[PDB]
Amino acid sequence: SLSTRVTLAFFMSLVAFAIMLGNALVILAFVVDKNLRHRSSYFFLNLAISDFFVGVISIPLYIPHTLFEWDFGKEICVFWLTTDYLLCTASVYNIVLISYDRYLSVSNAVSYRTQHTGVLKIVTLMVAVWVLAFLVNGPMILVSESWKDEGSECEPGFFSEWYILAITSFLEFVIPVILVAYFNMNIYWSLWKRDHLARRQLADLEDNWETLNDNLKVIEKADNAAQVKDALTKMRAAALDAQKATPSPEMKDFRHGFDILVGQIDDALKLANEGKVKEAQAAAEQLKTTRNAYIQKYLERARSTLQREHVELLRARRLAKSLAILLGVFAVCWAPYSLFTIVLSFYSSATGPKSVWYRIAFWLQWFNSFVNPLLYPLCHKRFQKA
Template sequence: MYALMSNASLAATSAGGEENISVVVDGCGNAVNKATHPSHFGVPLAVPEWEAIVTALVLSIIIMLTIIGNVLVILSVFTYKPLRIVQNFFIVSLAVADLTVAILVLPFNVAYSILGRWEFGIHLCKMWLTCDVLCCTSSILNLCAIALDRYWAITDPINYAQKRTVGRVLLLIAGVWVLSLVISSPPLIGWNDWPEEFSNEYPCQLTSNQGYVIYSSLGSFFIPLAIMTIVYIEIYVATRRRLRERARASRINAITLKNASGAGGGGGKDIISTQQDQESVSSETNHNEPQTNSKEIAKIRENPPTPKKKNRRPKIKDSLKEERQKHQNSERLLQAPPREDSITDNPENSSDGQKPNGDGLSLNDDKNTKLLLSNSTNRQSMKKAAGVYQFIEERQKISLSKERRAARTLGIIMGVFVVCWLPFFLMYVILPFCSSCCPTDKLINFITWLGYINSGLNPVIYTIFNLDYRRAFKKLLGIKC
């Protein structure tokens, strides 16, 4: 983020350690009197000592959390196997950019905000300002690259999966950093209004050259913001469309199941085939989530999941006994001899395998048995189809849940990005063109650090919604759960 800190410079205080009044230049170019405050460290401060301690403590915590978060992201991708996929290289590049912000930019900004003046020389000042623009621009452009990657993966999944090679991804990442260097380097080669020497009258701050302000703000923020807004709107629309398509496919599967069950149950494979076609166009917004692969689908086709079923034979035997009992009762009532065409279920006692047995089971009983067995087979087929349909429903619920979570994540990404960066870039663009605009130093510092905080929130936003990253973090931190 640009080091648009205090627009005033403080004169050195006396060695006596007492509060002094010095002449400074405010944001509107006016000379004003401003007090400096002594400290127990022997260094005059721009704020009271207690405020300096609180400020240093809070900002140091932000810096440490930013460093830890981005280091965890980088280590997770390179040490946790499920995360070693090509699209996560964009996340690594983002983490590197945010890490450089925390290491190279933020500590100097803490010192500058507390002291109210630059104590590290002109050359380090220029390098600090250049790193500020370079690293923060790279962070923003990496966010834009991630948005484009997800957009291409959703709108053209088959072709982009072939194009998304390691070489192409690394080339795009290199382009992000080169573009960031192109945006940040012009002040070093003369596009600036810097003085010959930085002094108390001329604090270490970015050039207010109006041409460079427009150029850098467009390249660093406004153009990436426009791209991200359009891309995420398209992703959101595509997600909503997929939700409607899958809801419609769920109703079609229900109708297919009913028809298949009515025809004797053999529609499980067709339903699995339909589900496979739907999964082939699944979203990659959360692209580290586990997906059902073709081998799993093939196994499901060969052995469709069925609910646990109890043994049906006892019930069939009970039904046969009831039928035999009814038959025997009717024989007694009619006092009729056994039928001539009765056949046995125990052929070993008959010379031709067909003679009545002691139960008197007749040909009608055999037909009843076949009918019962046929009904039992149909019921089993229907239960198998129901099991397949239940599996499909569970898969669809999981997929829909992923899509809703992805849409919610997109909203959070854009919301945090705009809240953190828009106030700063509005201030950055307005001040060079508004001679009467004189924000206080504390307001400038607050808006500046609001942009810096985005570098600490990025590893949270882009990883906390992903199960693999959470597992990798716990493994790195030695947390067992």
């Protein structure tokens, strides 16, 4: 109706104001608190900035186009479409950049985490990310939108041509999903291998320690039946198995301590092995001086290392789940558009792309950007507290 245009324009203005307020609050929480300015926040800022410009550009300029009468030129219309692609693809490309940074920080942690690269490239990536979207969306459709008819002006002219639509669909969405999944799988597999070797090696060390303690308990309660050799045989085996569990001077500290321990057990055994009448009352107590002084350091140190690997695994799992739910929301919002333009390309001359659901789809992509700052504080609750 005639009165519906004003109501829809007011609703669109309210939605744009809400999006702008959310993004401004996110930017303020970023710029005020200096704690969220590390590597874990440089590649996340554009996710709250680019889409922000959408609320300033896409939603308002759409009002004269639909609610009011079209009073803008074609150049203005193109620029709007241009902002729409640049700011849109920027989100998924920043997600890809975050995934690549995490892959470099986890897979190449032996060199990147130990020695961080210069920051002069960080911004060099960020802006490039934007221009990347341009190189994907800027020129191509510009060459293919050369149509004379003015029907569906700010609808892209490169439609109804299934080849470019199919190619772009893949580049904009499928290719990013691949890179993100590859990086996440590499990170998870590397961390599982780092923890599996640790879990097994620490379990083997604990089993050897438990066996050495059970044998030493019997050694302390020596029997008159010359049972020292039967208990020490097991003790020697335990020591030799725990000695070969490699976690340099630090390795020599560990190895030498074990060598001493094995030599102490070897001399303790001598009395029983010789068959000499005197076993010196099973004098292998001195092992307690070596058990709690030399080999205790690694028994405590390696345990802490396993704990470090586990927290890291939980943090990587949280980050992977966050990236996964972000990509899932993006896909759920983007798919209705891709399912209403490459399947309806068979007929587009008259009333083909003109329908309610297609307009709803256009809104849905904008909505992805509306909920983006709503689900952004879900990753870090600092914004919520501040």
